[PDB]
Each structure stands twice: as structure tokens, then as C-alpha cells.
Amino acid sequence: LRQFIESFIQERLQGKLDKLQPDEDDKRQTLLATHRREAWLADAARRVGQLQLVTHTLKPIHPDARGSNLHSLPQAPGQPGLAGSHELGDRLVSDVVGNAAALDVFKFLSLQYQGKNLLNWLTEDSAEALQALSDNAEQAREWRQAFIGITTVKGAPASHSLAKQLYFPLPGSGYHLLAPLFPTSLVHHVHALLREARFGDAAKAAREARSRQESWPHGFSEYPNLAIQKFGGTKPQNISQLNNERRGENWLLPSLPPNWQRQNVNAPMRHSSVFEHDFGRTPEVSRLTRTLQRFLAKTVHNNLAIRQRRAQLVAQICDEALQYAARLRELEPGWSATPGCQLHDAEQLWLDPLRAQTDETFLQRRLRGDWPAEVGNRFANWLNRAVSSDSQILGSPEAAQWSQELSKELTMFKEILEDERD
Amino acid sequence: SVTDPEALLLLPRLSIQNANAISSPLTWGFPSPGAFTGFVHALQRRVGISLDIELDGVGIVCHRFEAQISQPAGKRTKVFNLTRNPLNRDGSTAAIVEEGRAHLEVSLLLGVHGDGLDDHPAQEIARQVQEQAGAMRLAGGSILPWCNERFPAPNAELLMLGGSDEQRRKNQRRLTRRLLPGFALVSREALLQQHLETLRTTLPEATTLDALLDLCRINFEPWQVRDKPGWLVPIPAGYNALSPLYLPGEVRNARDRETPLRFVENLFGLGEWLSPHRVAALSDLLWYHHAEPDKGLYRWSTPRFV
Amino acid sequence: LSTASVLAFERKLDPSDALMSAGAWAQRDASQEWPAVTVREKSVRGTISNRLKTKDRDPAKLDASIQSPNLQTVDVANLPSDADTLKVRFTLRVLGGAGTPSACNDAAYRDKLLQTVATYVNDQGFAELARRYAHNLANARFLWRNRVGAEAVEVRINHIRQGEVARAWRFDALAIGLRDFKADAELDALAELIASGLSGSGHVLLEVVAFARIGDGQEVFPSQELILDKGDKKGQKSKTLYSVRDAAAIHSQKIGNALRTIDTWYPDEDGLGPIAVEPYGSVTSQGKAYRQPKQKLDFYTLLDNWVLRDEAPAVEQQHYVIANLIRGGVFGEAEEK
Amino acid sequence: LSTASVLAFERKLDPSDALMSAGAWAQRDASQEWPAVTVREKSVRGTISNRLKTKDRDPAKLDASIQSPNLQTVDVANLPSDADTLKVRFTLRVLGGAGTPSACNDAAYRDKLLQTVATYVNDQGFAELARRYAHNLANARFLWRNRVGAEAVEVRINHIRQGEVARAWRFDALAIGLRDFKADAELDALAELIASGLSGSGHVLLEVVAFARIGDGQEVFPSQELILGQKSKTLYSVRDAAAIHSQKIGNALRTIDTWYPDEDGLGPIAVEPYGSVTSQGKAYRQPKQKLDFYTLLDNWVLRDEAPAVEQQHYVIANLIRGGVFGE
Amino acid sequence: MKAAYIIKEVQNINSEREGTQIEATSLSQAKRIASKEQCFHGTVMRIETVNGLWLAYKEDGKRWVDCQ
């Protein structure tokens, strides 16, 4: 290449040099065309050995940590469902660690080693070793002292007292002390959550086409509940290359329970209940029942993957009904059930604790709790009256399949409602 | 099904304040399972030798969760609430090294193996485990012992090798009454592998494909949303070596000069929160950690969960 | 025979978050059903009246600045209009096993560390530290601004074995001050309980309730939350209060800071009072740090004079070093860099 | 010797929110069970009333803008159709320890500031300031627009021992002027109770109740919120009662400043640094002259140049309201 | 070209106050002339567009925190 050090002279004295006053005659007026032009790295040979090219580093754990930053890429596990940094190798971006003088010398050192252009020939112009300059070795003895020290950084594998060390028990034996590092390259690769997914152009095009109900074969993705982990302080350059497009921050994926953002104190039954009888209160009114199981239900032609989710999506409702029962089981230390209820009855086995008191209704309710079709069939019909526009299932052998899983949730629901009253 | 427990032990309702909520460089939320598998091993080296028993498995049941987060004005993401640290000796403010915190209400199904079951009563073991576990910290967070208006929740114990087949659905459906307001976190390693050869359209790795199960991603109208296999989350699933193993003195900043060291990375996987009524046997719900120290794999999972 | 590169201690005297309730005084023996104090928002308009610079002295440039007020939304927590009493309860656990590190490199340093901790303990108890930790519970210093200008403060401390109340205490928190640590009779039993909890192995659980009679509808002061990313829309509040499930609350680290203010042993402060125990002993309100490395008063210097070269300090400095072990802390000296 | 870069004073005279209720006059001695005033909505069609900016002088746009107007929803608070009296009730807490900062950054500046404030208190007490605060409790200036055009305003102040009433006071707020400070044998007692509260002798909690005959169904004016048929006006309400912000009640208490470097033909203003009123849009204590708060504080504390005896009351009154001072 | 900005001087970051319109070429020119034209000490400068979008802010002797 030839234009690589030649594109530096037109950007300096054209825009920034607007007036040169005689009050200053020290560095930019006399020395810039003398020593600062080509042989300028003589006095700048103290930031060039300062850097290090890493993949896993230590300073995001704590900025005052002075152990080892390592480059060594991992091996593959060999076990199925495990995701790490081992699946990179040509898509990885190698982090640089040093001072605040790592913008120019890094781009200068990067291009010559990574990015060579040898693909075409295996025989022709591959056996060449005499296409060098071929100069003498005695003429340049004294002042060429920088050939060997340009690469060799120090070793000395160390950790730090603020570096997050941990013990891991071996099988039938002692321990290994594990010191995890922060993966810069993997967090950088996952910071391509931005352009292809969140607010790049092809994603927001399909977000526009979602509102207009259009159709092209790019569906988009939506990432809820991400968190921001900001590294550095006000200075995300004393840590890493956190300055180009990852502005000293880290996007975190959620790992939350369903108990996440649960409502504080549940509403007790039989005070103003007109809609909420066996549904519970759930936020998936427009989510689980409206759009989920109601598309490609009228033109079902295969029965391999269709009725499995129709079998388990109602098992989810049968589970979350018991979840609602368990939430209203605790957390409610009082009952005043005399007003407000005119269609909600026979629930003393379902939403009532023992209370150390005979809450009987002229029956043997307090020590015996059988025939629980006052709940089981009573929401097994609630599930059927969640939809009434389905018409052509009648007179078909597939309507028997709908009564299979409701013969199943009328199998597994009885004895888990008798065993609480004893 | 390595080392089947002869006895399950239910630490009933542990209330935890200020647990670590970051849990990995990529995830956040409920803390790592390795915290729980280290907590059961810290129980094991305080009461496990004095009672000649073996605490080895652990079942994670989260009843209540709350994080110190806040949503900023005009963003759909979250940021973490912080603490004001002390100053320096210069008199200036120190750096803000941010940390996530969470409150936490958990239940722990432990699993007991040894010969100390047959010497002590089942009520001796449970007190010595429970009142020990109120002296310790779970995920960097304080385990808060009971005081309230109600009654303290007691530490039970089953003997799940004992009893007939009627007792094998009388006992394992009695504890599930005490685990039901919350959800259990299990390891789903077969889903993330069978979703990897499911992608025949592209030829990806597991990294971009675990990122394609966390999504409520929206498919174009041939709109609709791609199907839900359950409540799936990303979990840290162990560690993997990025260094050879070092002799136990040749780093002078280790935690101790008697144990070997490796520099490791994380290792991400898939898990599912599920109600414990889907669980056939509650011993299948337990978390173990196996290591391959000839490789660099130090990981944890729930085995025997089909 | 040298300082270990890793040395860390774990937090003994571990409190919880302090929830806030509200009811009436003299119904406070039956205060288990009082509703929580909730955090709500309000609006506030004010003029920018701060110190001007030197350069602009002009009536026109000042009067045009107060043509435009600024507005902001803040959080506020008040008692209800019929409640005059604030109830603040938290649970303390006193762990014990104090001088044992949770991390140490050198076996020699741990061996001549726990021996020096034992010859502190065997020569004199934790009773001097225990009276000063219990005194900060008996006066309600954990009520920070909720204490000032209160008419009556009443503290109730219950030792709890499993679910029972072994011994209960009862104090007038205003009757004992905040400056001078005095000796009492009902308070030394609590001091002996805290000392026997620190010395043994196994936790001692306390519940501490404070009742502050403040007035109907007055403002209470929960802890304020630190958010480093402020929302760039104009939507966001300017002041967020901490709340544990729709109940206004004080952080656990602020309660614990209030319990640690026992440090009266640095040769200064003829009228300041106790400060908190910290290495390089520093106060965030005062801004400065009172224990400096230029003088023989720092934990990093007192500790290794007392352990490595067995140059014991004064006894009042040994109390500081042991109190600084009870709070915890991560320490270095960094044998490799 | 120099001013500390961190100073912070707390406010003394803590007021609460003031909750508004309604009933009938001559049912005032049984006004504990009065119904609260509720904030409700109504629709508003408006008209083009503002100045036009001289490019909208044309009839072709003014007719089109008056043809299709804008419709708004406002929050309004009225009395009920049979209730004529507005009851307003808040509690006041008078703390004391007035000169001590809560955050400071010097030990010599703090010691000399406490020396200076102790010199002030030991020369004359808090009696002159407390007279002017008791006067703003006696007249019902904390009723802001709820006081103008009122047929009668009566203020009752109870002093609270434990939950019991030690002393009760009773004032006609319209006879006691809004633009003077006179003396009365029953207002001297309230002034010296507030003086014994600010100097630190006793614990002082007050219960202030004001009644105002506004008229049947007339509009009362709660404090107003900032907006986060789009709604044009939002009123402050604590649970469902209409209420007044605590800082607007607190503002109407420290309107005691009658010492200006400008003309005294405008009444008292509120104690502020650079003594300012937004409703008149100008600051009456300019730092061109030497009578704002910061210059007087720096001259009285640092270089021991005391101001006049009347300006010392102003400087101490700025220390009572608190604030973030210091360079 | 000369672009229009709104310079605001508020108490803290999340405060609303009517600002003054400037004429500046770059955002760095706006930060320079918002370094001056500040009357008070413990205040926050904020630079906005004409329609209310935030660009940068500075809080009492710190860096200009840019608003992405």
C-alpha cells in the first residue's frame, strides 16, 4: 500500500490552521515540518509497547484490579446445550487494553497482521523469498534498536484481591479455585443485539409493517425487560474500547421468575366479583386466548404439532388456577363474606383456610372435602365457554380429541383438592 | 440419576435481602444456580460432618421476587438502584462500581444420603440444618430468620426411599402443597440442542440460538407470535477454562495457597420456571454440579429431569 | 511474617430493611395491624436562588431569571391525618466468630491473627464494644431525621430463640443521649447478650421496634434512592424514595451505619460525637477523613503494627480495630500487581 | 475564616399538607366529621383570547380559529350546594436549633457561624421573628385565593401536649390585617410559644384550623399539579380530599420581610435569597446593593461586619427556612 | 449554516424550566456558550433542540454528559 501515510497532510493545515500568531513559536511552527512529520515516533516510543490485545479482561469487575488480562480463547465443551465464547474464532473482536493513547498505534498495528490477501495460487508467486530490498547489515547498526521490543510484553500470571475468586468442588475430592474474567468479545458480539434486532432499519421496517398489517418475509424480534450495566465511571476509556459504539454500558438479558412484578395484595373473592370467578385476574386476556390458539385452527390439516399445544396450553390454565388458589390461600387473614356475593358459592374447599373454626354450611365440610365438581366441572365449562364461534368441529372425529385433555384434567384434579382438609 | 437421595429436606421459606441480581455478564434477574449449589456445600461443611450426613442436591423454588430497579423516562430498559459508598481519604467521592440487588423469598429442597439418617431422628437433622442456615448468606444476601404475627414455618423431612407406592404419591404430593405459590427452576439442556438442529435454515451456533428463545418475537402474517414452549430463561450454566491449571502457590493473589487455580469464563444455557405439579418426583428437581477437571468444564444442572 | 495479599472480613451485626407503619400512640402495644406509610408524588415550583457568579451584576439579568421558575416532581411520605406515631421495625442478627477472616492467603498471618484476636478477647470482653453497639439501639439513632424534633421515642427490643420472646426490653430513647455513652442497668443485660452473641458461634436474633410520636400528617423521611442514569425525556421525578412492597423503608446499610457510630477514640472532636467506624475514618457529611496515614491511627497501620511486629496500640485503638473487624471489609496490600 | 463549600440547613417550621373539608358555619364546634371537598372534572369549551403575533391579524385565519375551538377537561373543586364554609386543617411543627447546619465542610467556619448565631440569640431572642410568624398564623394567609372575597375567616390554633390541648387560641383573620404587624394580648402568647419552640426550650406542635364563609357551591382553590379533550388543569388531592401543598402553606408563613432596599409601598414579601416574588417578576434584594442574603451572611460571619439590627432578622429568617448555601 | 438550540439552566437534571434560544453552528459551540451565560453555581445546564429533545447536560463542574 502507498497512500497510507500520505493522507495525513491535507487534514491538518487546511482546517485547523487559520491564523498563526507570533505569540507562539514553539511546537507547531518550526518543528512540525522538521521532526514531527515522519520520524516522530522517536520521542513517542513509550506508548507503543504499553498495550495488550485481549479477549477476557479484569477491569470491568473492578477498575482498581491489576491482575492478568488474558487473550486465550476457550475450547468447546462437548456437551449439548452450552453457549460460550468458544463458538467465535473469526467473528470475534479482539479488545485492546492500555492507556488513553490507543487510537492511532492500534489501527497502525492491526492492518498488517490481520487481513492478508492470499487465496488464489498455491504454486505461482508463493516460492518467493528474494523480493526484499536487499540492503547491507553493517550500515544500520546503532539506531535500529526497536525490532525486538515492539511485541514482547510481560507475563507473570496474576490475580487481584478484588477479582472474584471462587471454589468449585471436584467429584469425591478437594477443590479448584476458579477466577472468572469478564468476556469482552462475547459481550461485544451480543452487542449486535442492536443493528439486526432492536432499532436497525430492517427491523423497524417490519415494525412499521406490523402496524399496517402488511407482509414481507422478514419478521422482527422484540426484547423486553433488558437492563443497563454501565462500566467505567464518567470515563469509559480507562477500562476498554468502550468508546466507538458501546458507550461504556452493557445490555443484560432477563432471567426473571413468573413471580416478577406480581401485584402486592391479591383481591379477595366474593366482594364485587362479576367478571372474576374462575379466571382469576391475569394480564393475558388479549394474549393467551385472543391471538394464540385461534389462528390456523379452522384449516387444520395435520395433527402432529397442533394438538400438543392445545393440550398443554390448557394445562397451563389448570396450573395457574391452582396458583391463584395458593395466593388467595395465604396472605388473607380475614373474611367478611356477607355482602356483595350473589352468584359465587360452594368455594369453602377452594378459597378458604381452616381458620381453626367450624366454617361448615350444614354439612361435614370441616373434616371431609369430597365430590369437588363444584369447582372442577364448573371451570371445565368456563374453558369451553371461552369460545363459541367454533362450528365445524361437530360431527367430526377431531372433536373427540378436544374431550381427551378435558378427560385428563378431570383425572388429575380431584385428590389435590381433598388433601388440604384433615 | 447420580446419588439418589434417601431423604429430602425442606428448608421451608427463606427470606433474603440484597441478593446479587446481575448473575452473569449477559443475564440479570434471579441469581445463578451455582450460588445455591455452593450454599448447600457450605451447609455440608458446617453440619454435614457433625451429623455424618451428605447434603448434595438442592431444589430452587422462588416464591416472591423484587429487584431494586427503576425504569428511566423515555426508555423501555431498566437501570439498577445503587448505594452510596464511603469516601476516600482524599475527601472525594469514590468510583461508582454499580451492583444489582434483589429481595428474595425461596424454598430449598435438600437431599440427604448418608448413614446419619439411621442414627438420629428425622427431627434432629432438620433443626440442626435450619438453625445453621440462619447464620449464613445466600447470594451475597442475608438470610433473614423468622419473626412475624403468624407462626414460623417448620423444616420438614421425607424419607423418599421409605413407603409403598401409595406413600410415593402421598408424600410427594404433600410437599407440593408447600411449594405451590412459587415456581421451580429446572435445567433444560435438551431443548437448546434440539432447537439447534431445528434451525436448518441457517447454520448458527448455540449463542445466537439461545438468544432466539428469550424472545417474544413476532412473525409476519402469511401478525402472529411464534409459539411458547413454556417460561424459558437464560441461566449461567457453569464455567469453562481459558487457562491451564496452576500449581497452588504460583499466584500470590489467590484466596489461599493450597488450592489450584484456573482462569475461567462463563457458560450459558437454558432453564425453565415451572409449577411443581408438572413434577412427577421431587427428587428429579434437584441441582447438582459435576466437573470434568481433565477438561476445563465446571458446570451444574438438574440431571434425571426428563 | 507479612501482610497477606487477600484479607477480607464478613459483616457481623447485620440488620434488615426498616419498614414504616403509622398509627396512634397508646395503641402501640397492639401495633401489629397498623397500615404502612406509602410513598406518593407531588409537584413543587421554586425560584433558582443560588449564589451568583462574580461576573454578572445587573437587575435585568436577575429579574429575567425569576420570570421563569423551574418545576419538578418529587416523592413525599407523610403520616396519615389521624395517625401521630411512626412505627419503624427491623430485625438485627448478631453473628459472631468475629476475628476469623473470610479470606486470607498466609497461614502464618491467620495463625498470628486469630491469636491476637484471642488475646484481645481473653484479656477483655466484647463488653466495651457491646455497650456501644447496644447504646445505638437503645437510643433510636437509626431514626435519622425521624428522630429530630420528635416528642417521645420508645424502643422495644425482643430476643427471639425460635418463635418465642426470651427477654424483652423497653427504653426511653430520648432520655439517653447521642453524645455520652453511659452505663445503665437494663441496658447492660442487652450488652451482655450482644457480647455473648459476638463471642460464640451462631447467630443471636433481635427484633427492634421504635415508636416516634411526631404529629398528625407530618412528613416522615425514608431513605432516598441513588439512580445514576437519569431519564432524558422530561418525564422523571427528581427525588425517589425507597419502598419495600408499597411500604416506605430505610435501607439496611443506613441502619447499619447508624449502629456503627461508636468511634470516639481518635484524639480530636471535643464536641462532635461518635463517627462511624471506617478504614481511613471518613464522614460523608463532613466531607473529610479523620484518621489519616500521616498519623498512627489507620486500620491498615494499626492492624499490622498489632499483628506483624506485635506493637500493640493503646486499648482505645484496639477497640477501634476490633470494631472495624466486626463491620467487615475487603483489604489488599497486593503481593503481585 | 472562609465560607465552606458545603453548607446545608434544615427547615424549621414544618407544615403538613392542608386538607379541605366543607360544612355549614355555626356547625363549627362540631366540625370533626365534615365531608371532604372532592376534586372532580368538567368540560370546557374555550375561546381565542390571547394576543396574536401580528402575522395572525388576518380575518381568514381568525374566523377559522374561532369557528372550531378547543375543548378541555379541567379539575375543579367546589363546595357542596348546601355547605357555605371551607374548613382547612394542618399541623405545624416548630423545631429549634436554628443556627446549626446539618452538613458542613469546615470546622472554623461552623464554629464561627454558631458563635454568630448565638450572639444574635443572646442579644435579642426569637421574639421578633416569632411575632411575625404568629401573625401569619393569626390572619389566614395560608388560605391564598380561598381568603379573598370571604365573608368571614376564623382561625383556631391548638397547642398539643401529648394528644391533649394545652392552650387553644381563636382569631378573626379579617380584622387582623394582612399588611401590618400589630400587638395583642392573646397573639403575644402564640408568639412566645413559637419563640420557646424556635429557641429550643419546649416541644411545640400546633394544630391550625381555618374556616372561611365562601358561599354555597362556590369554587375553592386547592393547590395545582404540573401536567405530565386533553386535560388543562390538575388539582392536588391526598386520598380523595382536595388539599394544599405543604410548601405553599409554608410560603405563606415566612412572608414576614418588611425591610427592603427598595420601596416599602408593597407590603411583606416572603423570605428568600435575593428577595423575590414571581407574581411581580422582580427581585427586591439585588446584589448590586448590599442587602441580599449571601452578602450579608458573608459580612456578618467572616469579616465580623454586622448588618443593621433589622437585617439580622432577615438573615436568621433565611437560616430558619433552610437551604443549600455555601460556595 | 447556524442551527438553533435551547439553553436551559435548571436546578437538577429532571427539572423543567423555560430556556433561552441561541444561534450556534455546532454542538461544541453550544457547549462553549452554555459554559458561559450561566448565572448561578449549583445548577445544571441542558442543551435541547427547538422541539424538546435533549442533547447534552452538565451538572455543577463535571463533564458534558451527552444524550444518545
Next chain:
Amino acid sequence: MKAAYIIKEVQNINSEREGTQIEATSLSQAKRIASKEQCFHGTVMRIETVNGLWLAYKEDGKRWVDCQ
């Protein structure tokens, strides 16, 4: 694909009237062919699904107010 909509022309927003079924590809196509097929002046157009869920409406020379 061609989706089915219900175009309604009502007096005001909260009026019920039996509408006419169209065949349209997108919702913007339905808004274009509901801009026409309107007979009267002071009326409100409304676009619905086949089961009665509202999608958008337009009230006598204004924007289409979308129904989230």
C-alpha cells in the same frame, strides 16, 4: 393474501351500525378504500375486524385515530 375488514359509516364514534365487508391487503388499503365508499359529510368511518374489534376511525376531516 387478502384480509377481510368491516367498514362502517356511523354518525359519531360510539354508534353501532351494520357495516359492509371489504377485501383488503393492508390496513392502509382499507383506509384508502374507506376514504371513499363514504356517502355523507358529517359522519365517522370505522374499520373493524370480522369479529367486532375496532382498528381505526376517522371523524369528519381529521387523522385516522388508530385503536391500540
